[PDB]
Structure formats: structure tokens, C-alpha cells
Amino acid sequence: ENLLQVYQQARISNPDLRKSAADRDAAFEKINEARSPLLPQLGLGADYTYTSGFRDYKDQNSNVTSGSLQLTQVLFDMSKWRALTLQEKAAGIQDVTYQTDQQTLILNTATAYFKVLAAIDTLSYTEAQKQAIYRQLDQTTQRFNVGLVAITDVQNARSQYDAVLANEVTARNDLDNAVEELRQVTGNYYPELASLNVDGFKTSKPQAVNALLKEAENRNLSLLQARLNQDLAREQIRQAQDGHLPTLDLNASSGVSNNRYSGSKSISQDADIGQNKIGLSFSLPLYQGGMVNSQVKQAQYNFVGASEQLESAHRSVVQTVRSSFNNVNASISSINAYKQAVVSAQSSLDAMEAGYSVGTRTIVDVLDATTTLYNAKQQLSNARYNYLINELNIKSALGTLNEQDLIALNNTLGKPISTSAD
Amino acid sequence: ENLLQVYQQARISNPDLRKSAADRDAAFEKINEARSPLLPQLGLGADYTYTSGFRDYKDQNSNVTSGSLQLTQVLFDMSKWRALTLQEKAAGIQDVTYQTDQQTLILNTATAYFKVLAAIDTLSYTEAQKQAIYRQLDQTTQRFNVGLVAITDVQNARSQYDAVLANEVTARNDLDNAVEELRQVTGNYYPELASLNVDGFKTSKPQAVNALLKEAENRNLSLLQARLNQDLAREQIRQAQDGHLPTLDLNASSGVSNNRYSGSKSISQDADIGQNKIGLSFSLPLYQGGMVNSQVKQAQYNFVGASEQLESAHRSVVQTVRSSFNNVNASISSINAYKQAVVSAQSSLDAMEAGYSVGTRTIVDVLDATTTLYNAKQQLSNARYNYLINELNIKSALGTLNEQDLIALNNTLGKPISTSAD
Amino acid sequence: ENLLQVYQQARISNPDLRKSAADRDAAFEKINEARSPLLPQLGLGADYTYTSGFRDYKDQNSNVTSGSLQLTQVLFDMSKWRALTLQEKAAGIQDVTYQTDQQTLILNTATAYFKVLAAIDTLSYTEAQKQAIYRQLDQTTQRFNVGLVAITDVQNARSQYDAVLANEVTARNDLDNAVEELRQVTGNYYPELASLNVDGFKTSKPQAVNALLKEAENRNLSLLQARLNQDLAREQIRQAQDGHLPTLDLNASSGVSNNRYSGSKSISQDADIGQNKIGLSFSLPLYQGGMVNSQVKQAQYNFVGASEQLESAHRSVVQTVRSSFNNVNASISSINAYKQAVVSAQSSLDAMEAGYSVGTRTIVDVLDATTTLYNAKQQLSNARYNYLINELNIKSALGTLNEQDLIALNNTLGKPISTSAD
Amino acid sequence: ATAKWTTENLAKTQAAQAERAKAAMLSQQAAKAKQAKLTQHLKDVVDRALQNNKTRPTVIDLAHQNNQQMAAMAE
């Protein structure tokens, strides 16, 4: 119906966002799985054994029934604290990816909607071109049936008309596919969409590219992901060089046992045993074969790789920001150029009609001028829609693409128009 | 030689299929590795130790030589049964991926074969345009050397001829590259391929899009993979919330030992001991720090993500089915339109030749009409081949693409034609 | 400034290469982590326990404080030797990937340089076309203001002129974006680049395709990666069927303990214990439930998959080598064809100007001839640049792309030219 | 040559699309290489994790025989 309602339906139903949100929540919950090993771990065990000896122990059999309640707590284990911190950072990265997916949905919805609008305009101008060429063909056919013109003009007009008929077929198919893609994005079939208001259509120059680059370096999401991955690589170095450190544990236990010795040579006696241990274990790896040093060096190389990914992301951001700036400026210049071209092509079409009436020109020239005029109109329409999409591409490069940027567009739109290819 | 024989060599030799089959079989064998932990694990161990004391134990040395034969069986461990079931589901998913790869091979074979045929047609039409323009150029050169025309026509004809020459170069290159891609797909160089029978070429409208969508929902493979991934996520939830459960074990052992105490203060005596234990161990975790709850919540979020992937696959299937329907209908309409265009272009070309003979027109018009005619012919051929590929694309969307769909085509084909660019 | 200096800045600053080098070094360092298990693994431990009995042991409490220095060495463990060898092969594969990335950088730098040059030429020929059409338009406007021509020609010239202005806008934008992408590749903004020397431009036929295919099979990197992956899969089979084998260990230990028994019913006495063990452990799995057999079969299927990947890589290499050969030959033929087309188009433009002066032709024909001429010039330029890129693509297929292949080009270049779109 | 110029430019754009396909194939080769590197990395990591930890006498067999030696020790 318009761009806001389309985007709201999409945001509510689009499954890609809901999957990205699922991933975000899965990471933010895995934080707790990573924190768990630091919390007291209680377990229970129970054993039943029947031991029988066969060498200097013949006829010395035993029946043991034991049950233990083991507890374990970690007083000092830095590898697990680093794992918890690593998981927090990974959750942050997932949140940034979710933001990127929100922006991707906004941009895809806008692009699909305007693709449908562009396809409606293309079909409308293909039909107008067909009507114009058919008008010329009918005029020539009449002037021939009367005897004021030869069959050459009739045949030429017919050939041009048939070519335009094939273009109409292509345009109808493209419109149908544009509507199918829009429904894939949103989830609904839209028979009427708000159309662009070409009368109240304004082209504003984007702000200086230096301000765009500053805001992009500060806000762009492909950079936040890279900075967070760099921090993650630093924390991975720290986790790696935390293997030299010792660990403490507070293993406690409450055990009970029932021993029943049953054998002819069984000298031992039955027992009902109990125990309550409160232990404290300390571990300190001294030499691991160079495993820890190698892990630390690998982590340092991974940090170098992450820094280089950050530089690559910065270069891609700069490139895309400047490209979008140039593309908007070019779309403005193109809108103005095509407006002039459309005006001059209408003038030239009138000139060809006059010349053909006075005999200075031919009919192939008239039909070529008609084709030129309607190609200029199609190019102007596409230029407007590409200007809108390029504004959106800038706002995406800065990472500041949100619903208000769609409210602006929805304000640029106007009366509804049907998406049916009829 | 034709499409069936080409497809047979491809299916027999194509390495992508054989790799996908290797992956399928590897998964169906990993099923057994996943089932193994539920079977009796039998192991053997042997130790030799020399113990020496140095605090309240001086001169109390020992030489122990022990050997044990341990056996283990799992009477209750649901995590391992769930792992086995997960591996069965993963094997099913691999089988579906293999089916998708079979269909992909069929589609690629047909697409490459028709690409070769289309390239042959394009080269033939470019050569026919070259010959037509060369005839016109020779007529003008003769009529000029005799004096019935000026050099303007000769020079215009020469320019058009040179343009056509450049197009011929491009077309030959395209044909050679198309034959090279066909060889990449199949594995053989085909100097003769069965050509399309344009005389007995029929275009049948595809069945209603509702029937296509029903059969697609029922058979399409991008949906079977998604449904199987959803079931896999459900079983992963079950596996995760199967950590609260206890486990039972049937640890058995047959051990023997020889202790030799040798020391001045060695009060103990030598011994040759044996033992046969038949144990039963029971394990039950009561608390782990929210590990299992966190895993279950993560599995639930992954199941949500899998459901959203299923919805995304449903939308993609609907979109592609409707797109293929529209593309077939458009290709039919385009075949008809381009037939009419070719007939009208031939008429207009005759009209231009007549007019040039009577002086009403010029030669640039004649050569433009020739170009138009042969462009229309090329477009008609491309429309036929695209109609065939679009029929295949529908049959692929429904997941019902098999050898019989190629038998239909191979019946659509006809006399052989050479793939050499000469 | 030229291609060598550009490539040097790129090679020194390009972050993709530095990341690939980081990955290479990380693998070559992980070799040591993989070698670490084989080396001795010294470790320390210390425990403090307070045991208290409550069933047949009331008032029998103990306080034990122990400290151990454990050492471990691996005398026979083939799984770990196979892991070390696997890591070494993975390091080799990473080195080959680094080489592929070097070639990719060379190719991308050259492609960006020549894309910028092509854009500059395209904007030069669009400006030239604009100036030519403006001269024709001004001449017609003057001859009209004097009264020697009608307004029809003025309006047609205006329409053509406006169309060229819109093309000029597009060309300026394309040049700006080409500069942005070149800066993304290298890292600097180049206001002046060495231009192509079209006077001393030669096209040499590449060597026979059989020699190309031999050199590719021997040197191409997509094949070295595939062969190394095949060897890696074979070594994985070996690692898998090395699970049937036993393992030996040299477990040594130096332990000390202090037991303090404190209880009313505590019959035992305090102790200050020491021990020095030098053990030798032997492990041998006899049955695991088809685990090892299943792993071996999975590894064999993975080796089959790797062999099929190798065959796929061989087919891709053959295809790309022959394609690059055909593309170079086609670019040569296209250079020649477009040279002849430019000559013929200039002749035809002069012919149209003469005819228009004598009235045989019209002005739309003159402007069409101008457009044709300058399109031919653009096509010739693009053909030259594509010939250079296709030479580079051959040299990439053979895997012999290095700095000397760039020295050849840099010698093919000439005087500098400005990249500013003004 | 406009009737021919349009089709010429369209065939040129098709050749450029084929070049784009080749570039996309190089991209997919890069991505597949990265996936293979990740696979071999996880492979080596899992082999290391399940080798060293288990090579130390953590088997129930070895512990059981050591327990027999400790049992013999007190007699």
C-alpha cells in the first residue's frame, strides 16, 4: 500500500530477521553455558562390585556397594574466566550481526518495492510506445488504402510495431517477477502500491564526503564487527598465554560404603564405612612440550590477521561510502540530463512528424524518433528510482539506516497504482 | 551426439556427483561410528613400575608388573542414543543433498548443451548477416564502378560490413567457449550435437500454478532439507535436555599383578595376585551451574532458527515456482512475438530493397533492415532455447527432474550439427 | 604512476596478502603445537584433604598434604605422529593458498589499473563525441538563423546532443568509481597513471594450447592444492587405521606426602612419606564396537571425495586454460576487426558529411555516423585493454604470474595521463 | 549502425557477464578453500584434544590395575 506498511509487514514476518534474532539469543544464552564451569558442580555416583581372586587370593571374594556425593568448585582457573569473556565478546559480535541484518532487511524491502514501481513504469511506457507506433501504423495504412502513400511505409511501421510487441511481452514478464520478489521479501501479494510523486520530486545533494567518511568510521557496522573481532583476537591471545598459570579446586565429597567379604580364605571382615572429605587440589603445568608457547604464537598471528581484516574493512567502508556519494551525485546529474533529453526528444519527434508531412523525412525516422522519446522517458524514470536507492545506499554505508529513513521515502511517494500487468 | 548420450557420459564421469556420493556414503558409515559407543568396549592395559621411597620408606623398593583386561558396556546412556539418532538424521540430510546434486547435474548438462546449440545458431546467423551485407556491398561496388551510384553508398556498406565482421569474431569466440564449458560439464569434446528440430517444435502451456505449488511443497528438495533440519533441531533439543538423566555402566575387569618387594627395610613379601571384578557404576549429575538448562535453551533457540529457515525455504520455493511459471509463459509469448517480428522484418527488408531500387529510400536503410531481420532471427532462436531451459527450470522447482524429462527433450531434437566454429 | 610502482605499493600495503601470510604463519607455527605431545610433559600437583569418618570410623579423622611432580613421555603412539604429519601437510596447503593469494593480488592490481585506464579512455571518447555533435549542432543553428536549413535539423541535433550529455554523465561517474576501486586495491589515490602506448602496441599469439595445458598441469595452483588435499586424505586414512595399534608411555613421578591422623579412635599413626616411581604403561584396544573400522571406511570415502575434487580441479584448469587461449586469440582478432571498423567508420562519416552538403543524405544520418565512429573507437580501446587482461589471465592459469609478467606490461605502457574526471 | 550497435553492446555485456561469472567462480573457489582450511583446522584440533588427554593413563583399565597394585601394597 506504501513503503511503511510494506516494511512493517516485512519486519514482522521476514524469516531471515527471526533467524538472526534466534542466533543472537542463542549466543546470549551460551554466555551462561560458558559461565557454568565456574559455579559449584555437584554430582552423585554409586558403584556395585563383586571382586574375585585367582592367584594367592583364591576364595577371597568381596561384595562392595558404594555411594558418593562429590562436589567441585573452581577457586582459580583463568582459562575458564577467559572462556566466559570470550563468549561475552562473541555475543556482542552476534548483536552487531543482528543490527546488520536489520539494515539489510530495510534496504531489501525498499529495493524490492522500488523495483516493482520501476517495472510498473517500464510496462506503462512500453504500452505507450506501442500505442504511438500503432497510431502511426494505422495512419499509414489508411493513407495507403486511400492511395496517398506506398506499401513501404506500411511494412516498415508493421515491423516496428511487432518489435514493440515483443518488448511489451518482456516488460510484462519483468513486472510479474518483480511482484513475486516483493512478496518473497515481505510475505504478501500487493495489488496496489503507493506510486512515486514525480511532480513533488526533489533531489538534494548529500553532505560532503568527509562528513560521510567520519560518520561511517564512527557508525558503520562492517567496522564495528572488525573492531570487535580484533578485541576478540586480543582476548584469545590472553586466553592462550593463560595456560602457564596454575589452577585450584575445592573438591569435597561425602562417601559411604558397604564391604561384605565372603570366602573360605576370606580373612577380612564386613564393614560399613563412611567418609567426609574436604580437599583442595592444586595443579601447575611446568613443561608441556612447547604447546603453550606455540598456542600463544598462533594467537598472535591470528591477532595480526584480525588487524589486517580490520584494515580491509576500513578500506571497503571508505570505498563504498565514496562510491555511494559519487553514485548519488551521478544520479542527480542523470535526472537533469534525462529531463533535458526527454524534452528535446519530444521536440525532435514533433519535428520528424512535420518533416514527414512535408516529405523532408521518412516514416522510419518518425518511428525511430518515437522509440528515442520513449527510451528517454524510461531512462528518466529509472534515474529517479536509482537516485532513491542510492540515497538509501549512502544511509546504509554510514550504518544509520533505520525506520525514519523509510519515513522520508514514504513521504516522497504518492497516489496508489496497480501492480497487475493489465 | 544428443542429450541422452551426453547426459549418460556426464552422469558416469561427472566428479561433482561422485564427490556428493562419497559424502553420502561417508555419512551413512559414520552412523556406525555413532552406534559404536553403545557396544562392548574391550581394552587391555599393562604396567611396569619401580617404586622407591625416600622419607620414612628408605630401602623399601618395589617392582610391580601388572596386566588388566577391561570390558565396558553401557546399559543406560540416553545422550549416546540421541547421538546415534542425530547421525541417522544427518545421513538422511546427506541423501537429500545427493538428490539435489543429481538434479543439479541434469540441469547443468541440459543448460550447457543448449548453450552450445544456441551459440551455433548465433554464429550461423551472424555469418548469414555478413553474407547478406557483403552481397549488398558487392552490388553497390559494381554499380559504382559502372557509374550508377556514388561512393557514399559504398562507404556506408563498408562500415556496416566491418561492424558485422567484428560481431562474427565475437560469435566464434562465444561458440568455442560454449563447447569448452560443455566439455567441462560432461568430460568429452563433442564435434557433432543433435540439433533442435524447429519444424516440429511445439510449446505447451504448463499446468496451473496451484498444482505446481502443491507438487513443489510435496516434492521440492530445498524443502525436504529444511524439514529434515527442523527435525534435527528437535532431536537436538531432546539430546540437550537428556543431560539431566543418569547413566549406568557395566565395568568388568580381569587383572593380574606380580609385586616384588626388594629392600633392606622391606617388611612386605612378594605376591602374585589376581582379581576378576564385575562392577556396575551409576552416575547422576545433580547440579552443574546451569549448564544443561543453558544448553536446552540454546537448542530451543536453534530450533526457532530452523523453523525460520523452513519458512525462508518455503518462500523461496513459492517464489521460484511462480517465477518459472511466468518465465515459461513469457517464453511462449516471446516465441510467438518473435515469429511475427521475423516475418514483418523480412517484409520490411523486401520493402527497403524495392524502395532503394526506386530511389525512395537509401542504402543505410537497407542495411539497417538487414540487421533488424537477423537480430529478430537470433532473438527467436534464443527464445526457443530459453523456453526449453525454462521448462527444465519448472521441472527442477518441483523436484521432479529426472531422465525422462530429458527423454522428452531428446525427442524434441533432430538432425546433427557441427560444433566447430567453421 | 605506472604498473610496477602501483603493484609495489599494493604488495606492501594490501591487507588481504598480510592476512593470508598471517594464516600461513599460524599453520607453520601450529606444527609445533602438534609436535608438542610427543615431547615430555612435566607437570606438578599438590593436594590437601581433611577426611572424617562417620560409620565404623567415627573419631577417625586424617589430614593429608601431598605434592607430586609427574613426568610423561610417549615411546610409541602412532596417532600423534600421524597428527604431526597431518599438520605439516596442512601447512603446505596454507603455503599454496598464500601463493594463490599473491597471484590474485597481481591480477587484481593489473585489472584495476587497466579498468581506470579504460574509464579514462571512455570518458575521452565520450567528450570527443559530445564536441563533434556540438559542432554539427552549432553549424546547423547558424545555417538556420541565416535561412539555409529548417528547424527540423536543429531539433534533431539537439536531441542527439542531449543523449550524448547523459552518456557523458554516466562516463564521468564510471571513471570516478574506477579510481575509488583502484584506491581500494592499492591504498593510495593516483591522480596520474601511466597510459597505454597505442602506437607501440603489439599483439603476439600465445603459445600452442598443448604447451599451455602441460605447463598448467605442472604449475597451476588450483591443482597443487587439490593434489595436496588428496595426499592429506590419504594420510587421514593412515591416521584412522592407526587406532588398532597399542601405545607406550614412560610415566615417572616424584611424590611426597604428610599424613596426620587425629582422632580419639584413630589407631593409625602419623607418617611422612616419599616415593619415586619410574613406570612404563602399555595400552591396547582390542574392540570398540566397529569404531575404528567405521573411521577407516569414512576416511576411505573422504579420500574418494578428495580424488574427485582433484578431477574437478583438473577439468576446471583445462577449461580455464583453453578459455584464456581462445579469449586472447579473440581479442587479437577483435583488435584487428575494430581497427578496420574505425577506418571504415571515419570514411563513412566523411561520406555522410559530403552527402549532407550535396543533399543526398540528412543530418540524422550524419549524427548516427558520428555515434558509430566513436562507438568503434571505444570498442577498439576496450579490445586492447581486454587483450592485456587476457594475457594476464593465461599467465594466471599456468600459475606463472609474477612480477616479471607485470614488467612486460609496464614496458607496454607510456606517457602519464590524469585520472581526474575534468 | 544503431540497429547493430544495440545488439553489439548487448553481446559485449553478455561477454562481460561471463567474465563476472569467472570472477564469481574465483570467489567461490576462495570461499571453498577457506571452508576446507576450517575443516582441516577443526580436524587437527579434535585429533589433538582427544589424543593427549587420553594418552595419559586415564583408561579405566590402567586405573583398575593401579588399584590392584595399591591393594597389594597394604599387605
Residue numbers in the entry:
A (entry chain B), B (entry chain C), C (entry chain A): 1 to 422
D (entry chain D): 77 to 151
Question: Which lines from the publication concern this structure?
Answer:
Here, we use biochemical, biophysical and structural analyses to show how a bacteriocin exploits TolC, a major outer-membrane antibiotic efflux channel in Gram-negative bacteria, to transport itself across the outer membrane of target cells. Klebicin C (KlebC), a rRNase toxin produced by Klebsiella pneumoniae, binds TolC of a related species (K. quasipneumoniae) with high affinity through an N-terminal, elongated helical hairpin domain common amongst bacteriocins. TolC is one of the most prevalent drug efflux channels in bacteria and is frequently associated with multidrug resistance. Our results indicate that TolC, in addition to its known role in antibiotic export, can function as a protein import channel for bacteriocins.
Application of symmetry during processing then allowed for symmetry expansion of the dataset and subtraction of particles to give a single monomer, after which 3D sorting of particles revealed several classes where KlebC density was weakly apparent. A single class was further processed (see “Methods” and Supplementary Fig. 5) to produce the final 3.1 Å map of the TolC trimer with both helix 1 and 2 of KlebC resolved. In the final model, density corresponding to helix 1 and the N-terminal end of helix 2 of a single KlebC molecule span 109 Å of the TolC lumen; the N-terminal end of helix 1 is located near the periplasmic iris of TolC while helix 2 resides near the top within the outer-membrane β-barrel. The conformation of KlebC observed within the complex demonstrates unequivocally that the KlebC hairpin unfurls, forming a distorted kinked structure in which helix 1 is positioned against the α-helical region of TolC, and residues 137–151 form helix 2 within the transmembrane β-barrel of TolC. By contrast, in the complex with KqTolC this region forms the N-terminal end of helix 2. In contrast, helix 2 of KlebC packs against the β-barrel region of chain C with His140 and Gln141, from within interhelical linker, now forming hydrogen bonds to Ser68 and Asp47 of TolC, respectively. The N-terminus of KlebC helix 1 is oriented such that it is proximal to both chain A and C of the TolC trimer towards the iris, whilst the C-terminus of helix 1 can solely interact with chain A where the helices of TolC meet the β-barrel strands at the inner leaflet of the OM. The modelled structure of the complex shows charge complementarity plays an important role in stabilising the complex since several localised regions of positive and negative charge are matched. The unfurling of the KlebC1-254 helical hairpin required to bind TolC results in the loss of 1994 Å2 buried accessible surface area between the two helices. This is compensated for in the complex with TolC by the burial of 2384 Å2, predominantly through interactions with subunits A and C of TolC (1170 Å2 and 1120 Å2, respectively).
